[PDB]
Amino acid sequence: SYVMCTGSFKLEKEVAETQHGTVLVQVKYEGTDAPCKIPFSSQDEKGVTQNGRLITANPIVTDKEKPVNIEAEPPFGESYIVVGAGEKALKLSWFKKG
Amino acid sequence: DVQLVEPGAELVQPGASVKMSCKASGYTFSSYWINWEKQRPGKGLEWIGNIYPGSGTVNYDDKFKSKATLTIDTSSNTAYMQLSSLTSEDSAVYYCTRGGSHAMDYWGQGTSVTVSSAKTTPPSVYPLAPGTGSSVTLGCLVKGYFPESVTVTWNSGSLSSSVHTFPALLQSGLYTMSSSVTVPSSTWPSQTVTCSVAHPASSTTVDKKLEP
Amino acid sequence: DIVMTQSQKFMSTSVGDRVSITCKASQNVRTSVAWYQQKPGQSPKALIYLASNRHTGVPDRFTGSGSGTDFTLTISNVQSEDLADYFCLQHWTYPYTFGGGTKLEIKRADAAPTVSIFPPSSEQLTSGGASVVCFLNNFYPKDINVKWKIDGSERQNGVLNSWTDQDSKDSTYSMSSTLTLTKDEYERHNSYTCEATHKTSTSPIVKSFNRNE
């Protein structure tokens, strides 16, 4: 098994909807423990954790220099996508139309 | 009448790059995604990546990240794919297709990319005659030509029922193919049998009469 | 990445029968699976979207089913225009991945190959080349093996094989096998033999010639 990435993540480019209707976040890893398992979570409008919304199976960083695509299935309305662990976690707001 | 037009073929020198087009018509270009695929004989189809014309959103299969670049010219309803530093592993049919929530629906005709340093070369046409049975099989060996596009007919197309056309193979950087015809033994050599080979790329036509 | 497995590269059928083509996903892809039909030299045609929905214009002979990992394309009352390649595609997540394809062919009675051997032409020999050709024609099923011998010794180096797709007229297969030598090596040996092994007989079919005849 991989160890959970202990480092920080940043956005490589704008978060966007995919051809199949999911939401893709492409991240650039800033740590030094790759290959490592990406911590991921989703939150509702109130910042409360909601499970089962990660589409990508077992997202990993294999090389710190290579960005990683991560897809989520957010709920309609306001929510957050969170990449990484701790307070340093990359927290992205998302609004899903209709 | 949704259409996606791609040029038929591209010959690329090893190490060079190529840029191919996908021109859309019969629908709102900015309302749908465009996908790019690679199809090689013997290997399963591969998805290279996609692009959304209205926003510029683009996604790649990591396997093609260092090789392919997807761009657009929305004013001319065209999607482009550029492949860099080509090797023989890049020789394939490259398709574009319209996409969306229901995946690829309409596919383009495909661009056949051949990666080779070969020059246009006319074929050498050799007769294949027995050196019996109630039937006799005759052939023509069409060897050492480039690029891969020949036609072989028998008696200018008059003999067709028993003809076999064998797919070409790569041999010493050039192509080789063969064709066979079977006639009743009592009719040859009495009723002549001649293969006609056409290789348009080298403007070559060869008629080879089969001799006993 | 998700792997889409089509366990059957080839499937035999008869006009009017039912055929079920399977596609297995390596993870749960829900119903995000499309099916395509492709004929030689042609672009794929979309048949089924989201596992079970038929595209406009597609005959009702075609039905798709399954959810999760196990998908099936069913073709009822198979027609001769249905003889083609079929492949699945998952679009649950990037990268989209395709099944390896399943080619639908027509069943017919077993047939032994007609084997013919040909010496190099005098025209080729004048240029310094010596290609010995063997045609193994109109056999069924498609599986076949060819072995070459020079002066009774098995030769593998210099052999190139080409196979035709199923014939539209008689449903048989054919193969061309060419042993290419230089004239210098060809003129240092006498007998050239091609041997075909096929399921129709326990005894291979052997054809041969002597250069000195």
Side-chain angles (χ1 to χ4, degrees):
Chain A
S1 63
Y2 297 97
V3 172
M4 301 306 297
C5 302
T6 63
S8 60
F9 294 84
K10 63 191 240 225
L11 219 42
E12 183 68 11
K13 63 180 178 177
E14 285 191 339
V15 176
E17 283 212 312
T18 70
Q19 185 182 155
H20 45 285
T22 62
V23 177
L24 192 154
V25 175
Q26 184 183 64
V27 298
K28 166 70 174 76
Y29 189 54
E30 306 168 301
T32 55
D33 57 344
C36 60
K37 202 159 196 304
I38 301 174
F40 179 94
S41 68
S42 277
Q43 303 167 351
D44 65 21
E45 71 281 5
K46 303 188 171 241
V48 173
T49 304
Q50 297 301 143
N51 282 331
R53 296 190 176 272
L54 172 58
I55 292 295
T56 303
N58 302 310
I60 59 176
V61 179
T62 51
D63 183 339
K64 176 205 190 200
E65 301 302 325
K66 298 178 178 172
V68 181
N69 292 328
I70 310 171
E71 293 176 30
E73 191 182 359
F76 281 100
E78 298 173 316
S79 73
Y80 297 94
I81 297 163
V82 182
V83 186
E87 284 191 357
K88 192 69 220 287
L90 177 64
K91 180 162 161 173
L92 310 161
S93 62
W94 186 259
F95 185 84
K96 179 172 171 187
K97 290 224 98 42
Chain B
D1 117 76
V2 169
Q3 285 193 299
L4 302 151
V5 188
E6 301 179 77
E10 219 87 18
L11 169 65
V12 187
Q13 291 264 348
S17 290
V18 67
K19 197 172 171 174
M20 63 187 92
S21 62
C22 171
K23 219 286 231 317
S25 59
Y27 77 100
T28 311
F29 187 57
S30 71
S31 289
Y32 289 87
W33 287 75
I34 290 294
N35 291 276
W36 292 87
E37 286 71 55
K38 176 178 184 183
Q39 192 175 45
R40 278 205 273 179
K43 285 246 301 183
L45 251 156
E46 296 183 280
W47 176 87
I48 296 165
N50 68 178
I51 191 157
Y52 185 71
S55 303
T57 312
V58 60
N59 308 99
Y60 292 93
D61 185 329
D62 231 88
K63 284 169 180 193
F64 294 92
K65 250 221 237 175
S66 288
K67 179 68 58 182
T69 308
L70 312 181
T71 61
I72 45 192
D73 202 275
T74 53
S75 72
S76 63
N77 304 269
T78 309
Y80 300 88
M81 172 163 73
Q82 183 169 305
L83 304 174
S84 62
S85 183
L86 282 91
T87 76
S88 54
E89 288 295 281
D90 297 309
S91 296
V93 173
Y94 293 93
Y95 289 104
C96 67
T97 187
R98 193 180 72 168
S101 285
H102 295 178
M104 307 99 189
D105 49 12
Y106 295 94
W107 292 64
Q109 283 295 299
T111 298
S112 185
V113 175
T114 295
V115 184
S116 177
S117 59
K119 300 171 226 246
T120 296
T121 310
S124 287
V125 179
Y126 302 124
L128 301 169
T132 299
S134 52
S135 299
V136 60
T137 296
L138 304 170
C140 285
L141 178 66
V142 179
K143 186 176 166 43
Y145 65 92
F146 185 89
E148 213 303 88
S149 185
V150 293
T151 57
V152 179
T153 60
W154 292 91
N155 285 357
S156 312
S158 295
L159 295 174
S160 59
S161 300
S162 60
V163 168
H164 292 300
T165 307
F166 297 92
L169 294 167
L170 252 180
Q171 172 181 27
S172 322
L174 300 169
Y175 295 94
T176 301
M177 65 79 70
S178 57
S179 181
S180 75
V181 67
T182 306
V183 300
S185 290
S186 64
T187 77
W188 186 82
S190 58
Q191 295 173 239
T192 75
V193 176
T194 301
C195 71
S196 286
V197 179
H199 182 236
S202 68
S203 305
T204 302
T205 52
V206 180
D207 296 324
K208 183 64 63 173
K209 182 173 163 180
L210 277 287
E211 296 285 358
Chain C
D1 298 354
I2 302 179
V3 178
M4 303 300 283
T5 306
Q6 283 179 252
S7 61
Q8 307 304 299
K9 279 280 196 283
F10 305 94
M11 295 187 76
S12 309
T13 194
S14 300
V15 162
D17 286 4
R18 178 179 254 92
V19 68
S20 305
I21 300 172
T22 66
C23 169
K24 184 163 185 74
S26 59
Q27 347 187 331
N28 177 10
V29 292
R30 284 66 172 177
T31 57
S32 295
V33 171
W35 286 96
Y36 303 92
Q37 184 196 64
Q38 192 182 24
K39 296 185 181 194
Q42 293 176 54
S43 293
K45 184 184 131 78
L47 299 168
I48 305 296
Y49 64 100
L50 303 171
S52 70
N53 306 281
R54 192 164 40 239
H55 273 288
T56 315
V58 173
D60 68 351
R61 287 201 298 282
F62 297 90
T63 68
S65 62
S67 58
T69 61
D70 301 319
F71 302 88
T72 304
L73 174 69
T74 300
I75 311 166
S76 63
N77 183 30
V78 165
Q79 295 301 296
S80 65
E81 69 182 308
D82 305 331
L83 301 172
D85 252 57
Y86 293 90
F87 56 87
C88 59
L89 162 87
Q90 72 78 22
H91 61 110
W92 175 250
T93 200
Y94 297 137
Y96 296 165
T97 51
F98 296 87
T102 292
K103 191 166 243 136
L104 191 65
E105 299 169 301
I106 262 175
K107 202 193 287 167
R108 63 145 290 142
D110 291 348
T114 294
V115 184
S116 307
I117 196 172
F118 305 88
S121 60
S122 59
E123 295 101 313
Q124 189 179 25
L125 289 167
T126 297
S127 82
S131 296
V132 190
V133 177
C134 278
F135 291 129
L136 281 69
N137 290 344
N138 302 83
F139 57 92
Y140 188 89
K142 73 166 74 244
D143 320 87
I144 198 158
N145 280 305
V146 66
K147 183 193 291 179
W148 284 87
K149 294 187 183 168
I150 299 173
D151 288 335
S153 291
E154 183 174 1
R155 175 69 166 240
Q156 283 147 345
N157 177 239
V159 182
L160 293 178
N161 302 316
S162 183
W163 302 264
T164 56
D165 287 351
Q166 189 167 46
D167 190 90
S168 58
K169 292 177 254 123
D170 71 5
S171 299
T172 66
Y173 297 87
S174 299
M175 172 190 188
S176 187
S177 186
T178 305
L179 160 71
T180 306
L181 305 172
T182 57
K183 173 195 203 167
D184 195 355
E185 286 190 355
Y186 176 71
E187 293 190 335
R188 288 182 196 262
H189 302 277
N190 192 46
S191 73
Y192 292 85
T193 302
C194 60
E195 172 196 273
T197 306
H198 188 251
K199 90 173 283 181
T200 43
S201 183
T202 178
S203 303
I205 296 167
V206 173
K207 300 288 180 180
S208 185
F209 70 89
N210 292 330
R211 188 189 42 77
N212 77 355
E213 291 178 16

